[PDB]
Amino acid sequence: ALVFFAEDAAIIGLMV
């Protein structure tokens, strides 16, 4: 799958 990235503090992945 595709894993985007966002800064939630720290950077996390978002898997789709």
Resolution in A: 2.5
Read off the tokens for 2.
């595709």
Query: How many angstroms separate the Cα of 6 from the Cα of each of 2, 10, 16?
Result: 13, 8, 14
Solved how? X-ray
Using alpha carbons, list the distances in angstroms from residue 15 to 2, 5, 8, 11: 6, 9, 14, 13
- Give the DSSP letter string of 1-16: --EEEEE---EEEEE-
Is residue 16 within 8 Å of residue 2, measured between CB atoms?
yes
